Amino acid sequence: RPDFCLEPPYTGPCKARIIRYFYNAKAGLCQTFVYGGCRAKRNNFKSAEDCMRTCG
Amino acid sequence: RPDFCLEPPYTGPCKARIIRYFYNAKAGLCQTFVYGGCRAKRNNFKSAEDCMRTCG
Amino acid sequence: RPDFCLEPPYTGPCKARIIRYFYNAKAGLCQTFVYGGCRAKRNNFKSAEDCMRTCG
Amino acid sequence: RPDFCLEPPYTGPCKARIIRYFYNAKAGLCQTFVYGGCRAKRNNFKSAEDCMRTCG
Amino acid sequence: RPDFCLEPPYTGPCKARIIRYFYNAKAGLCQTFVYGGCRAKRNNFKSAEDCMRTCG
Amino acid sequence: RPDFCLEPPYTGPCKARIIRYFYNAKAGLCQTFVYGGCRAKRNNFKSAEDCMRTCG
Amino acid sequence: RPDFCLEPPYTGPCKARIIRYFYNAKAGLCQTFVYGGCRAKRNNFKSAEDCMRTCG
Amino acid sequence: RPDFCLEPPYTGPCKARIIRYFYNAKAGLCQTFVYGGCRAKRNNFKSAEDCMRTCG
Amino acid sequence: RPDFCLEPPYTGPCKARIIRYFYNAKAGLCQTFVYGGCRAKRNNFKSAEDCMRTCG
Amino acid sequence: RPDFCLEPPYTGPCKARIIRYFYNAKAGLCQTFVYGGCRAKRNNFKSAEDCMRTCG
């Protein structure tokens, strides 16, 4: 799996509260987290399916 | 039905206010609840259909 | 994980061609499959998120 | 529950193949069925949540 | 039309601000209202189409 | 209500089978119909809410 | 074009902050505006496509 | 407006039947057309809003 | 690519917090940003696909 | 960028016709393609945003 899948989720500085998925290496599962709307990092997926396919 | 379908809904520590479904054993129906966006428990479905099929 | 998560995907007799998720025990990942629109079995999730949470 | 919740699903004369929900009295659950796109009857819900709240 | 179609809209105790439809008997039309995310009453439809078919 | 609200539904020459709403003056309700994807007429709403507000 | 298409956008008394479209006669284009979730006026479309077809 | 807004809609070689919007210079409006799923040209918008804002 | 693709994102005076895409010339990629709901500028796409096609 | 981003799109054996995104290394852009509904490969994103972030 790509290296960025090991990064912890990053909400970023913005103020929106949107749900995104991230690969949780420890649990070996994609989980949700609140993304702020800007300055996203690589371990941030709009679609769960894409999360598990890229990082699972 | 799976045992987690008996757990009460868990909003979690996060600050988003997203609607999700959970199986209400007492009512024998899936209902909505506000999910904060992170650290979800098993009795939490994004889709009502999946809720009633897994827990109903 | 619930036992239905071990069932293979069931398209059913109907004619629609809708994408749904199912837990693929051998891959240990949820994947897509075409659902016909009726007579669904338990290993069939409208949302990938619900799939990995219930069966992952 | 309203009386229409006891009607069996009606696909209708049209040619589209859209998924809709209907209350299956015998199962006491809302399930999917393929709607043709026209001449819908009362036991036909676009949203699973609405189905179980109206008929459940 | 079902009797619940006469109830006025109920936002409920929750804090989310989601748009839902309700049948406005006086106007004989479904209209929107802000649903809080929990403890919904019968006159609350996620889909406008469902509102007008059930109550219209 | 606008005059186009009295026009009957027009599927058009195209081949897609998309659900749209149209105001059925006779029934005094918006209903669904299968739109072909092109050459739409005025009595064609992507949103049921818009149909009933514009023509209802 | 219907006369309501000339009305300026009405947010309404409610507290939700949903995006809707309205026909901006002066720009001769549909644009976005924040709808509060209740007490909507006619120049308020959930779908941009509906706005331009009804008012454009 | 960008020059591509003057191009006529291109369905492409693929077989899907998805609705998209294109700017119709003659009508000075964005309209729908059936996109095949591949080899899209510039005058092809997934969102009506983006169509009218880029080309309108 | 159109010149507006070089403009930095504009959130606008409104108070909604919706995610939109804008072309970031320096990164040569479309990214997200929080849009207020009104007074949008051209480098603002509701769909990421439209973003990269128009500006990429 | 991950290696899978260099793979060409794979429709697969299934019969559904759903649009997905893939990274087109030659064009240095994500584009659409028709996915069959099953047996997906890694260069297949349900969301354009995820595509450009993972592969762009």
Give residues after which chain B gaps, C-N over 2.5 angstroms. Answer: none
What SS3 string covers I1-56?
A: CCHHHHCCCCCCCCCCCEEEEEEECCCCEEEEEEECCCCCCCCCECCHHHHHHHHC
Contact H47 I45 (CB under 8 A): yes
In chain G, where the domains are located: 1-56
* CA A14, A15, A20, A21 torsion-angle sign: positive
How many whole angstroms separate alpha carbon B50 and alpha carbon D48?
A: 9
- B50 CB neighbours in chain A (<8 A) are none
Contact E18 G17 (CB under 8 A): no
How many whole angstroms separate alpha carbon F20 and alpha carbon D38?
A: 10
Question: Tokens in use for G17?
Answer: 């902050």
- A47 CB neighbours in chain J (<8 A) are 45-47, 50
Continuous segment of H or E residues that includes residue J52: helix J48-55
Residue type, A52: M
β-bridge partners, H27? none
**CATH number assigned to the domain with residue range D1-56, chosen from the 4 options 1.20.1050.140, 3.40.50.300, 4.10.410.10, 3.40.630.30:** 4.10.410.10
Q: Which chains contact I through at least 3 pairs of Cβ atoms less than 8 Å apart?
A: A, G, H, J
- A29 CB neighbours in chain C (<8 A) are 52, 56
Residue type, D6: L
β-bridge partners, C21? C32, C45
- J32 CB neighbours in chain H (<8 A) are 37-38, 40
What SS3 string covers A2-44?
A: CHHHHCCCCCCCCCCCEEEEEEECCCCEEEEEEECCCCCCCCC
Residue of F nearest to E54 (CA): F29
Distance of CA D40 to the CA centre of its chain: 9
Q: Apex CA H7: angle with CA H3 and CA H11, to 5°? A: 140
- At residue E31, φ and ψ (nearest 5 deg) are -140, 175
Residue E36 in 3-state DSSP?
Answer: coil
Residue of J nearest to A54 (CA): J42
Residue F19 in 3-state DSSP?
Answer: strand
Q: How far is CA D34 from CA C44, E45, I24, in A?
A: 16, 21, 43
β-bridge partners, E45? E21
Helix, strand, coil percent values for chain C (each to nearest 5): 20, 25, 50
Nearest to H47 among I2, I40, I47 (CB): I47
| Residues ≥6 apart with Cβ < 8 Å to D13 | D36, D38, D39
Distance of CA I7 to the CA centre of its chain: 9
Contact E34 G40 (CB under 8 A): no
Contact A40 I17 (CB under 8 A): no
| Residues ≥6 apart with Cβ < 8 Å to B48 | B21, B30, D47, D48, D49, D52
How many whole angstroms separate alpha carbon D52 and alpha carbon D22?
A: 9
Residue D32 in 3-state DSSP?
Answer: strand
| Residues ≥6 apart with Cβ < 8 Å to F45 | F20, F21, F22, F30, F51, F54, G47, G50
| Residues ≥6 apart with Cβ < 8 Å to I10 | I39, I40, I41, I43, I44
Q: How was this structure determined?
A: X-ray
Yes or no: say if E38 and E29 are a contact pair by the CB < 8 Å rule: no
Contact I17 A37 (CB under 8 A): yes
> Across the B/D interface, how many CB contacts are shorter than 8 Å?
21
- G33 CB neighbours in chain I (<8 A) are 14, 37-38
How many whole angstroms separate alpha carbon G42 and alpha carbon D55?
A: 32
Nearest to I50 by CA among J56, H18, J19, H42: H42
Helix, strand, coil percent values for chain E (each to nearest 5): 20, 25, 50
Question: Tokens in use for D9?
Answer: 């699903």
Nearest to H50 by CA among I46, I16, G30, I9: I46
Q: Which residue has the tokens 């119709």?
A: H24
Residue C51 in 3-state DSSP?
Answer: helix
| Residues ≥6 apart with Cβ < 8 Å to I20 | I9, I32, I33, I34, I35, I40, I44, I45, I46
How many whole angstroms separate alpha carbon B14 and alpha carbon A31?
A: 13
CA dihedral I40, I45, I47, I48 (to 10 degrees): -150
DSSP secondary-structure letter at G37? Answer: S
How many whole angstroms separate alpha carbon E46 and alpha carbon D8?
A: 22
Q: Looking at CA atoms only, how far is residue D20 from chain C in angstroms? A: 9
How many whole angstroms separate alpha carbon E7 and alpha carbon G16?
A: 22
Q: Which residue has the tokens 């989601």?
A: E18
Resolution of the entry in angstroms: 2.7
How many whole angstroms separate alpha carbon C2 and alpha carbon F10?
A: 48
- D53 CB neighbours in chain E (<8 A) are 40, 42, 44
Q: How far is CA J55 from CA A45, B18, C56, I29, in A?
A: 13, 29, 26, 11
- F18 CB neighbours in chain D (<8 A) are 16
* Preferred mutation among C15, C19, C44 to probe J, highest tally of J CBs within 10 A: C19
- Contact: chain F with chain G (3+ CB pairs below 8 Å): yes
How many whole angstroms separate alpha carbon C48 and alpha carbon C33?
A: 12
How many whole angstroms separate alpha carbon A34 and alpha carbon B29?
A: 28
Q: Looking at CA atoms only, how far is residue H26 from chain J in angstroms? A: 28
Question: Tokens in use for I48?
Answer: 């990421």
* Preferred mutation among H18, H50, H51, H52 to probe I, highest tally of I CBs within 10 A: H50
CA dihedral F5, F7, F9, F14 (to 10 degrees): -110
List, as one string, the DSSP characters of H19-54.
EEEEEETTTTEEEEEEE-SSS--SS-BSSHHHHHHH
Residue E29 in 3-state DSSP?
Answer: strand
